[PDB]
Amino acid sequence: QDLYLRELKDTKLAPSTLQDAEGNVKPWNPPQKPNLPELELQGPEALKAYTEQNVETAHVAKESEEGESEPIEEDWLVLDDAEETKESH
Amino acid sequence: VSTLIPPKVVSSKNIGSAPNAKRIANVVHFYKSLPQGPAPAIKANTRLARYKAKYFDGDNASGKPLWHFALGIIAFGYSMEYYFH
């Protein structure tokens, strides 16, 4: 149909100008290529953790806590304390 | 804090210091006890002891055990009056 074919033409070659050709758009002043492709590509990381989300900051798992291998001082006091607690058993 | 030995502290003190003292008195009391009423030593007889272990013995402990003294003293005193009066 002419109304279909003409619509397809005006909506395809112009769609070519918008997307399929890097001619941006004459009717609209700011091209989306200088707006979306790189800066708004940081919009994904603007919503994400910037230079940190894609990066995934290095955080190595640490060691758990222990008694510093100290039986010279902790063992005797622990024994006395446990025996004192045993006085009401 | 971390692992320990809450039960193993029975080393530093045995359970029941007062029960331990009571049981230590019990050991000395029961051990140093006769097997079955041992060491009786009842019989005795030497001049007067033949009367002591017989007449002062608690098998009877009736009234005649003292009355033997009265009868004997009366025997002595009758002769005392005979030699005196």
XYZ file of N, CA, C and O in Angstrom:
696
model
N 0.828 -1.198 0.000
C 0.000 0.000 0.000
C 0.865 1.252 0.000
O 1.884 1.306 0.684
N 0.447 2.255 -0.775
C 1.224 3.487 -0.866
C 1.341 4.163 0.490
O 2.430 4.597 0.881
N 0.235 4.252 1.229
C 0.297 4.782 2.584
C 1.126 3.903 3.507
O 1.678 4.408 4.490
N 1.236 2.610 3.209
C 2.108 1.712 3.954
C 3.542 1.801 3.449
O 4.477 1.906 4.245
N 3.726 1.771 2.129
C 5.069 1.862 1.567
C 5.710 3.208 1.871
O 6.883 3.267 2.251
N 4.965 4.302 1.696
C 5.524 5.620 1.982
C 5.854 5.762 3.459
O 6.890 6.334 3.819
N 4.976 5.258 4.327
C 5.267 5.261 5.752
C 6.519 4.456 6.055
O 7.360 4.898 6.839
N 6.665 3.289 5.427
C 7.854 2.476 5.633
C 9.101 3.215 5.176
O 10.134 3.190 5.849
N 9.020 3.893 4.034
C 10.176 4.632 3.539
C 10.560 5.751 4.494
O 11.719 5.851 4.925
N 9.590 6.594 4.851
C 9.880 7.746 5.695
C 10.234 7.315 7.110
O 10.849 8.078 7.861
N 9.850 6.101 7.494
C 10.138 5.589 8.821
C 11.309 4.624 8.838
O 11.628 4.085 9.900
N 11.915 4.359 7.689
C 13.100 3.522 7.594
C 14.348 4.303 7.230
O 15.352 4.215 7.940
N 14.313 5.067 6.137
C 15.468 5.898 5.813
C 15.725 6.931 6.902
O 16.877 7.163 7.278
N 14.674 7.569 7.408
C 14.822 8.358 8.628
C 15.246 7.487 9.796
O 16.115 7.916 10.574
N 14.682 6.295 10.000
C 15.271 5.399 11.002
C 16.708 5.076 10.692
O 17.499 4.852 11.616
N 17.076 5.043 9.412
C 18.486 4.914 9.076
C 19.276 6.096 9.619
O 20.338 5.916 10.225
N 18.751 7.314 9.450
C 19.450 8.497 9.947
C 19.578 8.466 11.464
O 20.628 8.814 12.015
N 18.518 8.051 12.156
C 18.568 7.995 13.611
C 19.547 6.933 14.093
O 20.408 7.213 14.935
N 19.435 5.712 13.574
C 20.226 4.590 14.066
C 21.113 3.959 13.005
O 22.322 3.826 13.222
N 20.551 3.554 11.864
C 21.307 2.766 10.895
C 22.358 3.578 10.150
O 23.203 2.986 9.470
N 22.329 4.902 10.255
C 23.402 5.748 9.762
C 23.848 6.670 10.886
O 23.030 7.157 11.671
N 25.158 6.910 10.959
C 25.703 7.761 12.009
C 25.537 9.229 11.639
O 26.470 10.024 11.785
N 24.349 9.593 11.171
C 24.008 10.963 10.869
C 23.273 11.665 11.983
O 22.833 12.805 11.787
N 23.129 11.027 13.142
C 22.469 11.601 14.323
C 21.060 12.013 13.902
O 20.322 11.178 13.351
N 20.644 13.254 14.134
C 19.359 13.753 13.665
C 19.479 15.259 13.472
O 19.976 15.967 14.354
N 19.048 15.760 12.318
C 19.098 17.195 12.071
C 17.996 17.897 12.856
O 18.205 19.005 13.364
N 16.806 17.293 12.958
C 15.726 17.934 13.729
C 16.039 18.110 15.207
O 15.570 19.078 15.819
N 16.805 17.197 15.802
C 17.147 17.243 17.219
C 18.605 17.652 17.369
O 19.493 17.017 16.795
N 18.848 18.705 18.150
C 20.179 19.307 18.192
C 21.249 18.372 18.739
O 22.285 18.195 18.074
N 21.083 17.752 19.904
C 22.175 16.958 20.485
C 22.144 15.524 19.989
O 21.140 14.817 20.174
N 23.217 15.055 19.352
C 23.267 13.646 18.945
C 23.391 12.720 20.143
O 24.136 12.980 21.090
N 22.665 11.608 20.075
C 22.710 10.609 21.132
C 24.016 9.834 21.145
O 24.402 9.309 22.196
N 24.689 9.739 19.998
C 26.014 9.130 19.968
C 27.010 9.875 20.849
O 27.753 9.210 21.592
N 27.078 11.206 20.832
C 27.936 11.922 21.782
C 27.365 12.016 23.188
O 28.022 12.584 24.065
N 26.172 11.465 23.418
C 25.494 11.545 24.704
C 25.400 10.188 25.389
O 25.782 10.055 26.555
N 24.892 9.172 24.697
C 24.638 7.871 25.304
C 25.843 6.937 25.230
O 26.193 6.301 26.234
N 26.505 6.836 24.073
C 27.409 5.691 23.849
C 28.529 5.551 24.868
O 28.880 4.422 25.228
N 29.108 6.652 25.345
C 30.214 6.566 26.292
C 29.851 7.121 27.662
O 30.018 6.421 28.666
N 29.363 8.360 27.739
C 29.082 8.963 29.040
C 27.945 8.244 29.754
O 28.075 7.868 30.924
N 26.820 8.041 29.067
C 25.726 7.275 29.647
C 26.068 5.802 29.778
O 25.400 5.093 30.536
N 27.083 5.327 29.053
C 27.631 4.011 29.340
C 28.229 3.954 30.736
O 28.323 2.867 31.316
N 28.633 5.100 31.289
C 28.969 5.202 32.702
C 27.736 5.387 33.579
O 27.842 5.265 34.806
N 26.581 5.675 32.982
C 25.330 5.695 33.698
C 25.039 4.342 34.310
O 24.509 4.236 35.421
N 25.373 3.271 33.581
C 25.279 1.934 34.189
C 26.115 1.806 35.446
O 25.676 1.180 36.419
N 27.315 2.395 35.454
C 28.132 2.396 36.660
C 27.812 3.593 37.542
O 28.191 3.613 38.717
N 27.132 4.601 36.997
C 26.606 5.664 37.845
C 25.554 5.118 38.803
O 25.515 5.501 39.980
N 24.688 4.231 38.311
C 23.770 3.519 39.192
C 24.496 2.429 39.972
O 24.079 2.062 41.076
N 25.577 1.891 39.408
C 26.379 0.873 40.070
C 27.459 1.541 40.920
O 27.433 2.750 41.158
N 28.418 0.754 41.403
C 29.548 1.289 42.160
C 30.604 1.766 41.165
O 31.192 0.969 40.433
N 30.843 3.078 41.138
C 31.669 3.681 40.094
C 33.136 3.316 40.269
O 33.722 3.520 41.335
N 33.729 2.781 39.197
C 35.095 2.252 39.209
C 35.293 1.211 40.308
O 36.428 0.867 40.653
N 34.196 0.711 40.862
C 34.162 -0.220 41.983
C 33.255 -1.411 41.725
O 33.577 -2.522 42.153
N 32.134 -1.211 41.035
C 31.247 -2.312 40.690
C 31.847 -3.251 39.661
O 32.017 -4.440 39.947
N 32.164 -2.750 38.467
C 32.873 -3.580 37.504
C 34.221 -4.009 38.062
O 34.694 -5.117 37.785
N 34.845 -3.150 38.871
C 36.143 -3.471 39.453
C 36.053 -4.582 40.486
O 36.940 -5.443 40.538
N 35.004 -4.590 41.311
C 34.882 -5.520 42.434
C 36.109 -5.419 43.343
O 37.015 -6.254 43.308
N 36.131 -4.345 44.134
C 37.239 -3.995 45.017
C 37.846 -5.204 45.717
O 37.123 -6.044 46.260
N 39.174 -5.302 45.695
C 39.873 -6.441 46.282
C 39.704 -6.423 47.796
O 40.105 -5.467 48.467
N 39.106 -7.484 48.332
C 38.888 -7.664 49.764
C 39.155 -9.135 50.076
O 38.238 -9.958 50.085
N 40.423 -9.460 50.324
C 40.798 -10.824 50.670
C 40.239 -11.163 52.044
O 40.298 -10.351 52.974
N 39.673 -12.359 52.173
C 39.192 -12.814 53.469
C 40.338 -12.901 54.475
O 41.425 -13.393 54.163
N 40.087 -12.414 55.685
C 41.110 -12.395 56.722
C 41.037 -13.653 57.584
O 40.231 -14.554 57.327
N 41.905 -13.713 58.594
C 41.935 -14.832 59.529
C 40.962 -14.606 60.684
O 40.702 -13.466 61.078
N 40.418 -15.695 61.221
C 39.610 -15.612 62.429
C 40.502 -15.364 63.640
O 41.731 -15.424 63.546
N 39.877 -15.083 64.782
C 40.608 -14.717 65.988
C 40.787 -15.918 66.917
O 39.927 -16.797 67.022
N 41.920 -15.930 67.610
C 42.287 -17.040 68.479
C 43.062 -16.479 69.666
O 43.212 -15.261 69.807
N 43.577 -17.370 70.512
C 44.235 -16.995 71.748
C 45.697 -16.642 71.622
O 46.392 -16.598 72.642
N 46.189 -16.424 70.403
C 47.585 -16.061 70.157
C 48.536 -17.161 70.624
O 49.721 -16.921 70.871
N 48.014 -18.383 70.722
C 48.780 -19.544 71.170
C 49.499 -19.240 72.484
O 50.729 -19.242 72.573
N 48.701 -18.969 73.515
C 49.197 -18.437 74.783
C 48.746 -19.329 75.930
O 47.770 -19.027 76.627
N 49.439 -20.450 76.152
C 49.150 -21.292 77.319
C 50.027 -21.003 78.527
O 49.825 -21.623 79.581
N 51.000 -20.101 78.402
C 51.811 -19.731 79.555
C 50.991 -18.912 80.539
O 51.101 -19.086 81.758
N 50.153 -18.009 80.032
C 49.374 -17.117 80.876
C 47.885 -17.420 80.893
O 47.268 -17.338 81.955
N 47.293 -17.762 79.750
C 45.849 -17.959 79.710
C 45.444 -19.286 80.340
O 44.359 -19.394 80.916
N 46.301 -20.307 80.244
C 45.908 -21.644 80.679
C 45.716 -21.710 82.189
O 44.713 -22.243 82.673
N 46.676 -21.185 82.953
C 46.576 -21.256 84.409
C 45.403 -20.441 84.937
O 44.662 -20.913 85.811
N 45.221 -19.222 84.427
C 44.090 -18.408 84.853
C 42.775 -19.063 84.460
O 41.805 -19.029 85.223
N 42.725 -19.671 83.273
C 41.522 -20.380 82.850
C 41.233 -21.534 83.795
O 40.079 -21.776 84.167
N 42.273 -22.271 84.188
C 42.083 -23.393 85.101
C 41.556 -22.920 86.449
O 40.603 -23.497 86.991
N 42.153 -21.860 86.998
C 41.683 -21.342 88.278
C 40.247 -20.847 88.172
O 39.434 -21.080 89.072
N 39.915 -20.174 87.070
C 38.561 -19.668 86.893
C 37.553 -20.805 86.786
O 36.473 -20.744 87.384
N 37.886 -21.848 86.025
C 36.964 -22.967 85.874
C 36.770 -23.699 87.195
O 35.655 -24.115 87.526
N 37.841 -23.850 87.979
C 37.690 -24.462 89.298
C 36.853 -23.596 90.231
O 36.064 -24.126 91.021
N 37.021 -22.272 90.169
C 36.186 -21.379 90.969
C 34.720 -21.510 90.575
O 33.831 -21.519 91.434
N 34.451 -21.610 89.271
C 33.086 -21.852 88.814
C 32.578 -23.206 89.286
O 31.375 -23.378 89.503
N 33.482 -24.175 89.443
C 33.087 -25.501 89.906
C 32.720 -25.504 91.385
O 32.195 -26.503 91.888
N 32.997 -24.411 92.102
C 32.728 -24.373 93.537
C 31.240 -24.301 93.857
O 30.859 -24.506 95.015
N 30.393 -24.006 92.869
C 28.947 -23.948 93.059
C 28.221 -25.001 92.228
O 27.012 -24.900 92.009
N 28.948 -26.012 91.762
C 28.376 -27.050 90.914
C 27.395 -27.918 91.694
O 26.208 -27.603 91.780
N 35.193 -17.183 75.540
C 36.069 -16.676 74.494
C 36.216 -17.725 73.401
O 35.833 -17.504 72.253
N 36.770 -18.872 73.777
C 36.954 -19.996 72.871
C 36.792 -21.273 73.685
O 36.206 -21.265 74.770
N 37.318 -22.375 73.163
C 37.217 -23.650 73.854
C 38.046 -23.650 75.134
O 39.063 -22.960 75.247
N 37.581 -24.428 76.109
C 38.293 -24.649 77.361
C 37.931 -26.029 77.898
O 37.498 -26.897 77.136
N 38.116 -26.251 79.195
C 37.726 -27.519 79.809
C 36.962 -27.247 81.101
O 37.528 -27.393 82.195
N 35.693 -26.851 81.026
C 34.943 -26.475 82.237
C 34.873 -27.619 83.229
O 34.902 -27.401 84.449
N 34.770 -28.858 82.746
C 34.673 -29.978 83.692
C 36.013 -30.386 84.275
O 36.077 -30.790 85.443
N 37.093 -30.273 83.504
C 38.400 -30.801 83.894
C 39.029 -30.008 85.030
O 40.133 -30.325 85.482
N 38.346 -28.978 85.523
C 38.855 -28.179 86.628
C 38.638 -28.865 87.969
O 38.945 -28.283 89.015
N 38.108 -30.092 87.968
C 38.043 -30.882 89.191
C 39.424 -31.216 89.726
O 39.539 -31.744 90.837
N 40.476 -30.933 88.952
C 41.837 -31.092 89.449
C 42.138 -30.111 90.577
O 42.711 -30.495 91.603
N 41.754 -28.842 90.410
C 42.163 -27.807 91.358
C 41.444 -27.955 92.693
O 41.950 -27.520 93.734
N 40.248 -28.539 92.681
C 39.505 -28.799 93.905
C 38.567 -29.980 93.710
O 37.821 -30.038 92.727
N 38.608 -30.916 94.653
C 37.645 -32.002 94.667
C 36.286 -31.491 95.135
O 36.181 -30.535 95.908
N 35.232 -32.144 94.645
C 33.883 -31.720 94.984
C 33.631 -31.946 96.467
O 33.983 -32.993 97.028
N 33.028 -30.952 97.115
C 32.621 -31.101 98.498
C 33.729 -31.033 99.531
O 34.104 -32.065 100.093
N 34.270 -29.835 99.780
C 35.297 -29.680 100.810
C 34.771 -30.087 102.184
O 35.444 -30.809 102.929
N 33.575 -29.619 102.544
C 32.929 -30.114 103.756
C 32.587 -31.595 103.668
O 32.841 -32.321 104.647
N 32.000 -32.095 102.576
C 31.843 -33.550 102.436
C 33.165 -34.292 102.432
O 33.220 -35.426 102.916
N 34.237 -33.689 101.908
C 35.547 -34.334 101.971
C 36.043 -34.451 103.407
O 36.588 -35.488 103.792
N 35.874 -33.397 104.210
C 36.267 -33.466 105.617
C 35.432 -34.496 106.367
O 35.955 -35.270 107.183
N 34.125 -34.523 106.097
C 33.262 -35.523 106.717
C 33.673 -36.935 106.317
O 33.707 -37.841 107.155
N 34.013 -37.139 105.043
C 34.401 -38.467 104.581
C 35.769 -38.865 105.124
O 36.026 -40.047 105.368
N 36.669 -37.895 105.304
C 37.967 -38.191 105.899
C 37.824 -38.573 107.361
O 38.532 -39.466 107.839
N 36.926 -37.909 108.089
C 36.609 -38.363 109.437
C 35.967 -39.744 109.405
O 36.234 -40.580 110.275
N 35.125 -40.004 108.406
C 34.492 -41.303 108.232
C 35.485 -42.422 107.963
O 35.295 -43.532 108.461
N 36.534 -42.157 107.182
C 37.518 -43.191 106.866
C 38.283 -43.598 108.120
O 38.446 -44.789 108.414
N 38.751 -42.609 108.885
C 39.464 -42.894 110.125
C 38.534 -43.549 111.140
O 38.953 -44.409 111.923
N 37.260 -43.146 111.154
C 36.324 -43.697 112.131
C 35.964 -45.143 111.812
O 35.991 -46.005 112.698
N 35.619 -45.430 110.556
C 35.195 -46.772 110.177
C 36.361 -47.744 110.088
O 36.216 -48.909 110.474
N 37.512 -47.298 109.579
C 38.667 -48.185 109.468
C 39.190 -48.580 110.844
O 39.376 -49.767 111.138
N 39.418 -47.596 111.712
C 39.924 -47.855 113.059
C 38.776 -48.240 113.993
O 38.592 -47.689 115.078
N 38.005 -49.226 113.539
C 36.861 -49.753 114.269
C 36.993 -51.263 114.361
O 37.536 -51.896 113.450
N 36.498 -51.833 115.453
C 36.624 -53.264 115.664
C 35.848 -54.031 114.595
O 34.851 -53.533 114.063
N 36.299 -55.249 114.248
C 35.598 -56.030 113.218
C 34.176 -56.380 113.629
O 33.222 -56.041 112.921
N 34.020 -57.060 114.769
C 32.696 -57.236 115.365
C 32.867 -57.272 116.882
O 33.060 -58.346 117.456
N 32.755 -56.104 117.513
C 32.846 -55.985 118.949
C 34.132 -56.550 119.517
O 34.160 -57.114 120.615
N 35.228 -56.394 118.778
C 36.492 -57.004 119.201
C 37.060 -56.322 120.437
O 36.730 -55.176 120.749
N 37.920 -57.061 121.145
C 38.618 -56.662 122.366
C 37.660 -56.535 123.550
O 37.473 -55.432 124.082
N 37.023 -57.643 123.987
C 36.106 -57.569 125.139
C 36.797 -57.545 126.501
O 36.649 -56.572 127.248
N 37.555 -58.600 126.830
C 38.301 -58.691 128.093
C 37.402 -58.508 129.318
O 37.441 -57.471 129.985
N 36.588 -59.524 129.623
C 35.624 -59.403 130.715
C 36.104 -60.136 131.966
O 36.013 -59.605 133.078
N 36.604 -61.360 131.813
C 36.873 -62.202 132.974
C 38.094 -61.714 133.750
O 39.053 -61.197 133.171
N 38.047 -61.881 135.073
C 39.145 -61.498 135.952
C 38.909 -62.095 137.332
O 37.785 -62.091 137.839
N 39.980 -62.612 137.935
C 39.869 -63.265 139.238
C 41.252 -63.299 139.881
O 42.132 -64.032 139.424
N 41.435 -62.496 140.928
C 42.656 -62.517 141.736
C 42.292 -61.915 143.096
O 42.143 -60.698 143.225
N 42.152 -62.785 144.098
C 41.720 -62.384 145.436
C 40.432 -61.565 145.399
O 39.349 -62.096 145.668
N 40.536 -60.271 145.082
C 39.349 -59.421 145.051
C 38.716 -59.390 143.664
O 37.502 -59.185 143.532
N 39.520 -59.583 142.615
C 38.999 -59.536 141.254
C 37.999 -60.650 140.972
O 37.110 -60.470 140.129
N 38.117 -61.788 141.660
C 37.114 -62.839 141.535
C 35.752 -62.349 142.006
O 34.718 -62.919 141.641
N 35.735 -61.301 142.835
C 34.477 -60.658 143.197
C 34.155 -59.491 142.272
O 32.979 -59.224 142.002
N 35.175 -58.781 141.788
C 34.927 -57.607 140.953
C 34.302 -57.997 139.619
O 33.272 -57.444 139.216
N 34.908 -58.957 138.921
C 34.389 -59.348 137.616
C 33.123 -60.183 137.724
O 32.472 -60.428 136.703
N 32.767 -60.630 138.930
C 31.572 -61.438 139.153
C 30.439 -60.632 139.782
O 29.299 -60.690 139.310
N 30.732 -59.875 140.841
C 29.706 -59.151 141.582
C 29.501 -57.721 141.099
O 28.397 -57.183 141.253
N 30.519 -57.091 140.521
C 30.377 -55.766 139.937
C 30.146 -55.832 138.435
O 30.214 -54.802 137.757
N 29.883 -57.020 137.904
C 29.578 -57.209 136.498
C 28.104 -56.929 136.240
O 27.231 -57.221 137.058
N 27.834 -56.367 135.068
C 26.512 -55.896 134.722
C 25.561 -56.931 134.174
O 24.523 -56.560 133.619
N 25.884 -58.219 134.293
C 24.948 -59.253 133.861
C 23.668 -59.202 134.685
O 22.569 -59.419 134.164
N 23.795 -58.928 135.984
C 22.639 -58.766 136.860
C 22.430 -57.310 137.264
O 21.388 -56.725 136.951
N 23.407 -56.712 137.953
C 23.335 -55.319 138.405
C 22.112 -55.080 139.288
O 21.622 -53.955 139.412
N 21.628 -56.142 139.922
C 20.432 -56.082 140.744
C 20.776 -55.465 142.095
O 21.811 -54.816 142.259
N 19.899 -55.648 143.078
C 20.159 -55.134 144.406
C 21.100 -55.955 145.260
O 21.777 -55.394 146.127
N 21.168 -57.269 145.042
C 22.060 -58.097 145.848
C 23.530 -57.790 145.594
O 24.346 -58.014 146.506
N 23.934 -57.302 144.415
C 25.360 -56.992 144.200
C 25.911 -55.960 145.166
O 27.089 -56.036 145.534
N 25.102 -54.980 145.572
C 25.529 -54.069 146.629
C 25.308 -54.685 148.006
O 26.085 -54.441 148.938
N 24.254 -55.492 148.152
C 23.906 -56.066 149.447
C 24.939 -57.066 149.947
O 24.973 -57.348 151.151
N 25.758 -57.630 149.057
C 26.845 -58.487 149.523
C 27.796 -57.714 150.428
O 28.281 -58.254 151.433
N 28.048 -56.444 150.100
C 28.875 -55.596 150.950
C 28.238 -55.408 152.324
O 28.929 -55.436 153.348
N 26.913 -55.214 152.364
C 26.222 -55.044 153.642
C 26.292 -56.310 154.488
O 26.552 -56.247 155.694
N 26.072 -57.472 153.868
C 26.164 -58.729 154.605
C 27.569 -58.942 155.156
O 27.738 -59.323 156.323
N 28.591 -58.688 154.340
C 29.960 -58.852 154.794
C 30.352 -57.901 155.905
O 30.993 -58.299 156.885
N 29.972 -56.631 155.763
C 30.272 -55.653 156.801
C 29.528 -55.998 158.084
O 30.018 -55.737 159.186
N 28.330 -56.581 157.966
C 27.607 -57.029 159.154
C 28.339 -58.181 159.823
O 28.422 -58.243 161.056
N 28.873 -59.110 159.026
C 29.688 -60.185 159.582
C 30.900 -59.631 160.324
O 31.255 -60.114 161.408
N 31.553 -58.618 159.748
C 32.696 -57.989 160.405
C 32.283 -57.264 161.680
O 32.931 -57.408 162.720
N 31.199 -56.492 161.620
C 30.766 -55.708 162.758
C 30.216 -56.514 163.910
O 30.335 -56.080 165.057
N 29.609 -57.671 163.640
C 29.168 -58.517 164.742
C 30.359 -59.000 165.556
O 30.340 -58.948 166.791
N 31.417 -59.447 164.876
C 32.641 -59.811 165.578
C 33.281 -58.588 166.222
O 33.913 -58.691 167.279
N 33.126 -57.417 165.600
C 33.637 -56.188 166.197
C 32.950 -55.885 167.520
O 33.608 -55.489 168.487
N 31.632 -56.056 167.576
C 30.897 -55.859 168.819
C 31.244 -56.942 169.833
O 31.329 -56.676 171.038
N 31.436 -58.176 169.361
C 31.808 -59.265 170.257
C 33.153 -59.002 170.918
O 33.315 -59.214 172.124
N 34.134 -58.541 170.140
C 35.443 -58.222 170.698
C 35.429 -56.900 171.457
O 36.319 -56.649 172.277
N 34.437 -56.047 171.198
C 34.378 -54.723 171.811
C 33.471 -54.695 173.040
O 33.919 -54.353 174.139
N 32.199 -55.050 172.870
C 31.197 -54.897 173.928
C 31.501 -55.745 175.158
O 30.954 -55.507 176.235
